[PDB]
Design a protein around this ligand. Structure first.
Ligand SMILES: CCCCCCCC/C=C\CCCCCCCCCCCCCC(=O)N[C@@H](CO[C@@H]1O[C@H](CO)[C@H](O)[C@H](OS(=O)(=O)O)[C@H]1O)[C@H](O)/C=C/CCCCCCCCCCCCC
Ligand SMILES: CCCCCCCC/C=C\CCCCCCCCCCCCCC(=O)N[C@@H](CO[C@@H]1O[C@H](CO)[C@H](O)[C@H](OS(=O)(=O)O)[C@H]1O)[C@H](O)/C=C/CCCCCCCCCCCCC
Lengths: 206, 206
């Protein structure tokens, strides 16, 4: 993770679209390292959001220099269907997946665990799901999450996979995750705040 | 469905690849008519198989004239990883989805129902799942099927969707499904038999 840190936030809290998309594009490949086909459709959905945002950006990178520019330009371009359109909608969902990853990783780094099963990551994933995604899912998708949770790797195995080849301890691995989390968390928080400020957030369930 | 009937089988039971792929390519769009996002990853998997087979075919349509040609050419081309490779693997999975659809539709047409809930299609889908797919799924994916089953439409709604614009009765709709099922079922049966004859069938679970 720490090979692709996000940029620090500038004083004006603007997030450059190009570097943001470049950074977060390194996250979906991690889903191929979790040891299950159950992660295939997940990877697909997150990558699909990234692809959509990049496709809008590519139409005019200067116009879409920042994530704020995307929202404001699309609000002007689309009128009534906005924010349920375009890159605004894609980023609305992407931020939820990014927040899931943030909460999950932070929970692991913070030593949160089921003391009865300290080498599982279920409690960490459940917390992340509850905080990031659950209320945007109808009861059927929530039931699917609960089933998919059983496909999660052991903690020790997950941390091994995050540091393969590097010959580092788990303690060192977790320090590098904490480093990644600094600008990552700050960036996601700014994106959420922007959605509030722009009245671009929707609450529909799938 | 009856606007894209499969070809009848010739005496030699060979199935031409091009027309087969053209016909079955009309089936994944039906998943957008079931009223739920839960069908998105399903459509993606079936379409992915079709795309893979078409990509192999397109490298040399004469060499890959029939489905039998695909298996025999790939067996020669690949040696030891076969049949877990290429279009052979894609068709191995595609036939299972096609068989699911066949069993499901046939069950509906045959009047099979839960007499306590005659306007659901759960019993029909469960039968199809059991016959076509279940034993290739580990327990986690099976649990996901059980959840996804609740996203199925009402029977009357499903049959309406299959005949939209046509101004036909449900009886007429079902007669047209029965017509589609004739060459469809025969074709799928031949494909299954070919996999047996070629020793191309695998039994691994996902
Ligand atoms: C960095 C290391 C990695 C850290 C993460 C590792 C964590 C591992 C630990 C535990 C595992 C826990 C279980 C997994 C939890 C996954 C959470 C990760 C993030 C989730 C991504 C899905 C987000 C989501 O809910 N999306 C939902 C909404 O999508 C959005 O819909 C919009 C329209 O309303 C747009 O189309 C939008 O796209 S746009 O680009 O056009 O705007 C699009 O993104 C999407 O519906 C859900 C997708 C997941 C698939 C769920 C359905 C599966 C059904 C399967 C049925 C099969 C049954 C039959 C079997 C044969
Ligand atoms: C004609 C009208 C339409 C008729 C049908 C309507 C029926 C509606 C009624 C009731 C609904 C019942 C529930 C739905 C049942 C669906 C059955 C339809 C057919 C299923 C298609 C999936 C087949 C399958 O099991 N595939 C499996 C194996 O795939 C194959 O894997 C191979 C490698 O081992 C290859 O990669 C291969 O591709 S290849 O091209 O490279 O060779 C590929 O096809 C595939 O893994 C399953 C895909 C379905 C997705 C399941 C996982 C969902 C996990 C979601 C987790 C989300 C949790 C977190 C939430 C945020």
């Amino acid at each position: 993770l720490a090979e692709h840190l996000l940029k620090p936030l500038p004083a004006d809290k603007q997030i450059e679209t190009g570097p943001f998309l470049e950074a977060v594009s390194h996250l979906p490949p991690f889903f191929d390292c979790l040891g299950s086909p159950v992660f295939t459709p997940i990877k697909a959905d997150i990558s699909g959001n990234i692809t959509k945002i990049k496709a809008v950006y590519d139409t005019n990178p200067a116009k879409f220099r920042t994530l704020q520019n995307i929202l404001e330009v699309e609000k002007e371009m689309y009128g009534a269907e906005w924010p349920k359109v375009g890159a605004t909608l894609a980023l609305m969902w992407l931020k939820r997946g990014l927040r899931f990853i943030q909460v999950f990783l932070q929970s692991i780094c913070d030593g949160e665990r089921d003391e009865n099963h300290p080498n599982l990551i279920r409690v960490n994933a459940t917390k992340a799901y509850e905080m990031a995604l659950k209320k945007y899912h109808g009861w059927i998708v929530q039931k699917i999450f609960q089933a998919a949770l059983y496909a999660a790797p052991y903690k020790s195995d997950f941390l091994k996979a995050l540091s393969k080849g590097q010959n580092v301890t788990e303690e060192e691995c977790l320090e590098k995750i904490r480093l990644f989390l600094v600008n990552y968390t700050a960036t996601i928080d700014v994106i959420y705040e922007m959605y509030t400020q722009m009245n671009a957030e929707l609450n529909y369930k799938v």
